[PDB]
Amino acid sequence: TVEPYKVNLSQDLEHQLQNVIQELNLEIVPPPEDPFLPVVLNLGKSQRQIGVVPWSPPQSNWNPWTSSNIDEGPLAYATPEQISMDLKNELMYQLEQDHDLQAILQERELLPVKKFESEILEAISQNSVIIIRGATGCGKTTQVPQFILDDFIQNDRAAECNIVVTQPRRISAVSVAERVAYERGEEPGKSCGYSVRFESVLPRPHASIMFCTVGVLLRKLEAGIRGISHVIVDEIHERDINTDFLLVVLRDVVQAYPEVRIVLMSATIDTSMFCEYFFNCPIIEVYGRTYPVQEYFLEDCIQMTHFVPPANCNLICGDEYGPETRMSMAQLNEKETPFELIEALLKYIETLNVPGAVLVFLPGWNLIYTMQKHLEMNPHFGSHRYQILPLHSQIPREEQRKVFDPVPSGVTKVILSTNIAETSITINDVVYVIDSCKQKVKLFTAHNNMTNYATVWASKTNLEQRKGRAGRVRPGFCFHLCSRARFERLETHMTPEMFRTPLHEIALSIKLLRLGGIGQFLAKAIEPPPLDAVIEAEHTLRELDALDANDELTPLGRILAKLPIEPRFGKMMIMGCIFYVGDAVCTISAATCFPEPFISEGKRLGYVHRNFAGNRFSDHVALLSVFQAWDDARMGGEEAEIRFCEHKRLNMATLRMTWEAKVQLKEILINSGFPEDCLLTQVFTNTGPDNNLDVVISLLAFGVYPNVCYHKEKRKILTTEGRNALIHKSSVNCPFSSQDMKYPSPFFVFGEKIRTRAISAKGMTLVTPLQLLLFASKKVQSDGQIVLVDDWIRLQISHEAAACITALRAAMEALVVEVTKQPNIISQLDPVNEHMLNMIRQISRPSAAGINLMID
Numbered sequence: 056t057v058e059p060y061k062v063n064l065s066q067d068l069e070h071q072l073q074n075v076i077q078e079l080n081l082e083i084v085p086p087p088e089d090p091f092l093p094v095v096l097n098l099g100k101s102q103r104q105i106g107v108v109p110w111s112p113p114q115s116n117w118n119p120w121t122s123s124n125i126d127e128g129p130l131a132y133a134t135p136e137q138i139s140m141d142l143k144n145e146l147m148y149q150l151e152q153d154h155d156l157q158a159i160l161q162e163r164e165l166l167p168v169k170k171f172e173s174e175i176l177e178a179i180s181q182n183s184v185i186i187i188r189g190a191t192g193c194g195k196t197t198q199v200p201q202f203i204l205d206d207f208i209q210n211d212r213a214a215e216c217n218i219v220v221t222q223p224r225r226i227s228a229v230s231v232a233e234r235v236a237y238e239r240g241e242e243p244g245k246s247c248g249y250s251v252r253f254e255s256v257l258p259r260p261h262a263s264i265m266f267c268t269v270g271v272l273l274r275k276l277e278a279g280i281r282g283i284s285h286v287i288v289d290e291i292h293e294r295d296i297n298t299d300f301l302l303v304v305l306r307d308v309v310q311a312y313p314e315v316r317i318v319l320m321s322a323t324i325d326t327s328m329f330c331e332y333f334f335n336c337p338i339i340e341v342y343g344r345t346y347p348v349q350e351y352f353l354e355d356c357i358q359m360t361h362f363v364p365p366a367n368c369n370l371i372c373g374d375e376y377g378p379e380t381r382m383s384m385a386q387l388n389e390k391e392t393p394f395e396l397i398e399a400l401l402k403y404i405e406t407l408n409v410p411g412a413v414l415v416f417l418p419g420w421n422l423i424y425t426m427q428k429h430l431e432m433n434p435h436f437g438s439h440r441y442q443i444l445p446l447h448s449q450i451p452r453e454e455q456r457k458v459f460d461p462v463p464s465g466v467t468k469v470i471l472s473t474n475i476a477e478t479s480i481t482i483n484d485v486v487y488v489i490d491s492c493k494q495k496v497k498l499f500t501a502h503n504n505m506t507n508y509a510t511v512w513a514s515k516t517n518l519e520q521r522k523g524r525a526g527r528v529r530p531g532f533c534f535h536l537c538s539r540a541r542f543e544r545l546e547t548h549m550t551p552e553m554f555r556t557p558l559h560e561i562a563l564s565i566k567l568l569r570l571g572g573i574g575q576f577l578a579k580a581i582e583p584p585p586l587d588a589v590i591e592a593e594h595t596l597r598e599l600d601a602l603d604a605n606d607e608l609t610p611l612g613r614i615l616a617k618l619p620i621e622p623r624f625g626k627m628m629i630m631g632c633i634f635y636v637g638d639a640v641c642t643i644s645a646a647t648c649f650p651e652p653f654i655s656e657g658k659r660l661g662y663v664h665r666n667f668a669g670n671r672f673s674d675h676v677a678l679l680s681v682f683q684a685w686d687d688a689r690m691g692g693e694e695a696e697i698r699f700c701e702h703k704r705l706n707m708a709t710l711r712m713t714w715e716a717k718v719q720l721k722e723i724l725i726n727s728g729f730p731e732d733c734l735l736t737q738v739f740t741n742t743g744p745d746n747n748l749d750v751v752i753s754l755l756a757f758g759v760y761p762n763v764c765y766h767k768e769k770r771k772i773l774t775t776e777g778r779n780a781l782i783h784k785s786s787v788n789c790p791f792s793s794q795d796m797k798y799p800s801p802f803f804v805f806g807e808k809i810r811t812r813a814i815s816a817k818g819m820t821l822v823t824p825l826q827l828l829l830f831a832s833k834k835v836q837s838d839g840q841i842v843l844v845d846d847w848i849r850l851q852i853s854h855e856a857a858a859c860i861t862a863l864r865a866a867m868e869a870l871v872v873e874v875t876k877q878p879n880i881i882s883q884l885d886p887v888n889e890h891m892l893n894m895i896r897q898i899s900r901p902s903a904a905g906i907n908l909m910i911d
C-alpha cells in the first residue's frame with residue numbers, strides 16, 4: 056500500500072535517452088492505448104549436443120601441482136631411480152639426526168591406525184578403490200597419506216607417488232597440511248602442501264602430498280588428473296556436496312583407468328551405500344582404545360545441577376524425574392540453548408574431581424561468542440581456574456592451535472566448538488562433552504531469494520558421534536541438552552547437502568569438464584539431487600546466457616566456470632571490465648568469499664567505520680574505501696599496516712586474503728583475453744563526483760539482483776515479495792541512534808536477504824530509480840504514466856525513458872555476449888557501443904535522478 060515514487064528526470068536526459076535508442080536502431084515497445092492494458096517493456100535477447108576425466112600416472116619431468124613441465128634444474132632429465140634414491144637417503148639421514156623428529160615419530164606409532172598399516176597398504180595396492188572405516192581420532196587423515204608415501208619412498212619408488220587428499224573444509228585442508236608437515240619435520244612446501252580457494256603453498260613436484268578443497272581439484276580437472284597416483288577423498292560421511300559430486304567423477308575415472316588408486320575415508324557409519332557405488336570395494340576397519348561414556352539428557356542435567364531457569368518436547372518428561380525437574384524443563388524454549396545450564400554443568404563437573412577438558416558443541420560463532428561472554432562475566436571462570444577457547448572457521452590458525460595445547464593443573468580447558476570437532480579434528484584430554492544437539496545449516500530458497508542460517512536439530516548419528524568425543528582418554532560424560540522425548544523425534548541422519556544446496560556451480564563444472572548433460576550426470580550421483588534444484592540451476596544459467604538454447608556452454612559460461620565465484624558476480628565482473636572498472640568489481644566479488652573486515656562485534660557501526668562510507672549510503676563503497684586506505688597504509692610496511700588495522704578496527708587477515716583473491720580473479724580474466732588496462736586500480740572519492748564509482752554501483756545492482764528493497768521509515772524496508780523487513784544493524788545505513796536518516800532515494804540493493812526472526816537486508820547500497828530500472832529489474836510494465844517493476848514497486852516516470860533504459864539493458868547484454876566471444880574488443884571498441892556505454896555512464900550518476908549527495 057505505497058504510492059508510486061516520482062522520478063525527477065530532466066527533458067535534456069529524456070531526449071538524450073531517446074536519441075541513443077534511435078541512433079542504435081534499438082527496438083522499443085510503444086506506449087499503450089488503453090491505460091488498463093499495460094504493456095511489457097522487457098525486450099527479448101549454438102553448438103551440437105557421458106565424457107570421462109582423463110588420468111595419467113606420475114612422471115619425473117612433470118610438476119602435477121603447477122600442471123607444467125620441469126625444464127630447468129636437474130629434475131628435468133633426472134631418472135625416477137635417481138630421484139627416488141636421493142629422497143630415500145635424505146629421509147633416512149633426517150631420521151638419524153633429528154631427535155625431536157624421532158620423538159614425534161614415536162607419537163605417530165601409538166596412533167590406533169598404526170596397527171593397520173600393512174593391511175591398508177596391501178588393500179590399496181591390490182584394489183583400484185578401497186574404503187577406510189574407523190572412529191574419529193584413529194589417525195586416518197594425518198597418517199594414511201604418510202603411510203602411502205613412505206611405502207613408496209622406502210621401496211625405492213618415491214618418484215611414482217603423488218597424492219591428492221580432498222577435505223570438505225578450507226580450515227581442514229590448510230591445518231592438516233601444516234600438521235602432517237610438522238609430523239615430517241618440515242614446513243608446508245616440501246613433502247606436503249595445500250591448495251584452497253585463493254591460497255596455496257604447493258609441495259615439491261615429486262614424492263609429495265597435496266591437501267586441497269574439492270572445488271580446487273574440480274577446476275583443475277578440465278585438463279585431466281595429470282601425474283597423480285592416489286586420490287584420497289576424506290570425511291565422505293559428512294556428505295559435503297562437492298565431495299558427493301567428485302565421487303561421481305571418480306567412479307567414471309576408476310572404471311576407465313583402473314591403475315589409479317582411490318581411497319575413501321569415513322567415520323563409523325554405514326558405508327554400504329559407498330561400497331556398492333564403487334563396485335563393492337573392500338572396507339578396511341580401523342579401531343583403538345574406546346572408553347564407555349555415560350550419557351545424560353536435559354532431564355538429567357537439570358536435576359543434578361538443581362538448575363532453575365528465569366511440538367514442544369520440554370513439556371514431556373518421565374515420572375521417574377522429580378516435579379521441579381519437570382517444571383524447570385517445561386520453562387526452557389527449545390529454539391534457544393540454555394546458556395545458564397551450561398554454566399551450571401561446568402560447575403557440576405568440578406565436583407566430580409576428575410580432571411579433563413570439556414568440549415561444548417554449539418551451532419555457530421554467535422552462540423560461541425554469547426557463551427564465551429557469559430562466562431567471562433563471572434569471575435569464577437577466570438584465568439586462574441579456566442581456559443575457555445573458541446573453535447570455529449574464522450578464528451586465526453594461531454588461536455586454533457591453542458585447543459590442542461595443555462593447561463596448568465588446576466585449570467580446566469573448555470572448548471566452545473562448532474561441529475568441526477565432531478568428526479574432523481580430535482581434541483585430546485576430553486572427558487566431558489556438553490552437546491547443544493543443534494547444527495548450523497545454510498538454507499536458500501530461490502523463489503524469494505531468501506537466505507536462512509538456520510539452527511536445526513542434529514541427528515542421532517551426530518549425538519552418538521559427539522558423545523564418543525568424551526571417551527578417548529578415560530570413562531567420560533556427555534550432557535545432551537535435548538529432552539529424552541526430543542531425542543526420539545530426531546532423524547537418524549542429517550539431510551545431505553545434495554538435497555538442499557543450489558546446483559548452478561556444479562552445473563557449470565559438469566559443462567566445463569564436458570561430462571554431458573547436467574540432469575543426466577547428477578542422476579548418476581550416489582544420492583541424486585531433487586528435480587526442482589536441477590531445473591533451478593538450468594534456469595539460472597540460461598538467464599545468465601551461460602548456456603545457450605541447446606544447454607551447451609557459451610563463451611560467457613566458460614569464463615564463469617573458470618571463476619571461483621558466484622556466476623552472477625562473474626558476469627558483473629565481465630561488465631566491470633567493459634566499463635574499465637574491473638579492479639573495483641573484482642574487489643566487491645572477492646569480498647563475498649570472506650567475513651566482513653569491519654570488527655563491529657554485532658553492534659551498530661561507530662564513527663570511524665561509518666566515515667569510510669562517505670556520502671554514498673553504501674556498505675560496498677565503505678568496503679572499497681577501506682581497501683583504498685589499507686593499501687595506502689601498507690606503503691609504509693607491515694607495522695604501519697598493523698597499526699592502521701588496529702586503529703581503524705579492521706581484520707587485517709581478511710583484507711590480505713581478499714586482496715589475494717582479487718589478484719587471482721584478475722589473473723583468470725587476463726588469461727581469458729581481457730586487457731590489463733580495464734583491470735587497473737583506480738583512485739576514487741567517496742564524497743565528490745566520481746563516474747567510475749557511479750558505474751560500479753550500477754553493476755552492483757546487477758550483481759545482487761533480485762535483492763532490491765524500498766525504505767519506508769526508520770529500519771523498516773519493503774522487499775520484492777511485498778513483505779516488511781529490517782535494515783541490518785551492521786549497515787552504515789542503519790541509524791546509529793534515534794536520529795532518522797534522510798536518504799535521497801528510498802531504493803537499496805543488498806548482498807543478502809536473511810531470515811532470522813524477521814527479514815533482514817545486509818550489505819546495503821543506495822541506488823537511484825534509474826539504476827533500479829537499468830540493472831535491478833527483470834520485468835517492467837507501463838500504462839503510459841505509471842510503471843510497475845517486478846510486481847512490487849511503482850514509479851511515476853515517462854513511458855519513453857523507462858523503455859529506453861530497458862533497451863540499454865538489452866543492448867548491454869548483447870555487447871556482453873559479443874565481448875565474451877572476443878574480449879579484446881574492449882580496448883578497441885567501436886563508436887556505436889561507446890555511445891551506448893556512455894549513456895549508461897550518464898544514468899548511473901546521482902544527478903541524472905536529480906540527486907546531489909554532497910547536499911543534505
Ligand SMILES: Nc1nc2c(ncn2[C@@H]2O[C@H](COP(=O)(O)OP(=O)(O)O)[C@@H](O)[C@H]2O)c(=O)[nH]1
Nearest residue numbers: 191192193194195196197198234459479481482
Ligand atoms: N596436538 C595436535 N594433535 C593433532 C593435530 N591434528 C591432529 N592431531 C591428533 O592426531 C591424531 C589423529 O588425528 P586424525 O588423523 O585427524 O584422525 P582421524 O579422525 O582418523 O582422521 C589425534 O590424536 C589428533 O588429536 C594438531 O594440529 N595438533
Ligand SMILES: [Mg+2]
Nearest residue numbers: 195196478479
Ligand atoms: Mg579425519
